[PDB]
Each structure stands twice: as C-alpha cells, then as structure tokens.
Design a protein around this ligand. Sequence first.
Ligand SMILES: COc1ccc2c(n1)C1(CCN(C(=O)c3ccc4[nH]ncc4c3)CC1)C(=O)N2CC(=O)N1CCC[C@H]1C(F)(F)F
Ligand SMILES: [Cl-]
Length: 293
Amino acid sequence: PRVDFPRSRLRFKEKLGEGQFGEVHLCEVDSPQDPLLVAVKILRPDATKNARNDFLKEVKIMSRLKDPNIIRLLGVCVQDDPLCMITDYMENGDLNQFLSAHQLEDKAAEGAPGDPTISYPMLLHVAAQIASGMRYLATLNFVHRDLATRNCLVGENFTIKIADFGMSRNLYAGDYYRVQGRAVLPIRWMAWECILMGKFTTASDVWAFGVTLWEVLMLCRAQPFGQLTDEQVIENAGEFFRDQGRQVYLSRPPACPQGLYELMLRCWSRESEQRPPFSQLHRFLAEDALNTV
Ligand SMILES: COc1ccc2c(n1)C1(CCN(C(=O)c3ccc4[nH]ncc4c3)CC1)C(=O)N2CC(=O)N1CCC[C@H]1C(F)(F)F
Ligand SMILES: [Cl-]
C-alpha cells in the first residue's frame, strides 16, 4: 500500500478545471524534498457519496498507468480527507488550444524562439508521442474511448500526455452528440462500429487516433466533418456499414503528404482487423515520415 503524499505541503494557487466528480487546482509544493508546480484533483464542493465512489475508482485506474506519454499519479492522499490525486503540471494546457495558436512554418527553422510557428517535423513529433501513449495503453488492453486533441496536455518542450477530461468542458460541447440534454458521444471521432454496434476496442481507438492525427495536421483549425451536422455524421456511419462506396472521409490536410494520408485512411478501414496497430503508426510517424519521397 503506497504511502500518502503529505497534504500539508500543497499550496493551492489557481483552478485549472472542473470535471464530473473532481476539480483540478494548480498547487505549489512547499520545498520539494521527496518552485515546484503540480496539478491536484480533489472532490468538487458539491460531492456526494456517488462522487467519492467515482473518485476512489479513478485512483485505482490511474494506479495502472506508468508511461511518459500518459498522465501519471505523482502521489495520492486517500487514507483520510480531503482526497487528492497529484500529477505533473503541464504548462501549455490542452493540445487543441495550443496548436490552434500556432501557424505552420514556411521554411524549416526560419523563426525566432517564442514565435507562434511550428514545423511539420514537430507535428509528426506530437503525433508520434500520442501514438506511443496509445501503444502503451493497448498493451494493458485499456480502451480510451475519447481520444482527441482536446484530451491531450502539453508540457515543456512540446512533450505530450494523454488524459481524459470527460465530456464536461463547455469549451468542447460541440464535439459531443447529446442525448437528454447531456453530452454522451464524440461521434466525429468514433468508428462506425462504435456508433452502430456500441463496440469500443483498441481498433476503434485506432480510428480515433486517425481523426486526432488529422486534427494535428490541420493545426486544430477545424472540427472533423465540421460543415456536416451530427445527424449526417451518424448517417455516414451507416454508409460504412452498408459498404457501397457512399461513405465519406476526412479530407487530406494541406500540411499532410499523400503517404501519411494513406496511412490515415487505413485507420478508417471498414474492417477493424485491417486498421494499423499503434506500433506501426508510431514507427511511421517517428521514422518513415522523415524519408524524402
Ligand atoms: C490530478 O489527478 C488526475 C487524475 C486523473 C485525471 C486527471 N488528473 C485529469 C488531468 C487533466 N485534467 C485537468 O483538468 C488539467 C487541466 C490542465 C492542466 N495542466 N496541467 C495539468 C492539468 C490538468 C482533468 C483531470 C484527467 O484527465 N484525468 C483522467 C485520466 O487521465 N484518465 C482517466 C482514465 C485513465 C486516464 C486516461 F487518460 F488514460 F484515460
Ligand atoms: Cl466537412
């Protein structure tokens, strides 16, 4: 049984987010002997028995995860109240808002440090870290179910970590299909068998990664299928099922060469078994994509 982090050492500084059962604060750790900034998730002030149960379950889930490109618990406080989970502070926030504030470079390495520009090789590097994170989760047979740039965090030096904020942020409400007034399904990231059969697998996470890769190469300027309605996106899932060549795909991003786009298309194969494994996606993004055509 791991020992609790010493709660008294936290200095609460700013609120970073609010989710379904917890809320996240930026904290300073008063002199770190085993300015240090960490993110700390605690129960919402309106927490009921249901919220505490959900929080204790998440501690269990998070205890499974140990990879540089996945959120990791730096510590916990669970033996007594208040309950806390502690992770690294990622100073550049979510990847969607981050990339949207950048523009693609003209020539490689032409700008000054700090400028809001980004290279194609850096887009590859961001995607490759996401693929490495997902490759890790696949080995634990952990199915994420909501991969997208909004659920990735950005630290120093463009390091990426996969998280899962839930469907709670007003900022991203448009990314979720609603049933009975609440967000339920990120349909624009969902494989046709997720929509039609309710089947979530590693291969559907591969489909979502394809959309996330599309997002990254679009520098998060547009929503997937952004000029189609939710009903049309759901209808498109039906055309994948019927397989008579009426299905439509996300278009090739301007910044994306044809070779990379064809691998993206493979992520959206009708048959789950034909989609690439995350091992192959990572190898391509990390090495083959640097090849000169
Ligand atoms: C502090 O302790 C925790 C513990 C868990 C989580 C979290 N914190 C956040 C971390 C981002 N988050 C911010 O509100 C947030 C916002 C800005 C920030 N900057 N630096 C850190 C940070 C965190 C929601 C809670 C989050 O998503 N979760 C879920 C999570 O990671 N899950 C759920 C299943 C397994 C795993 C995943 F990805 F693999 F699916
Ligand atoms: Cl569109």
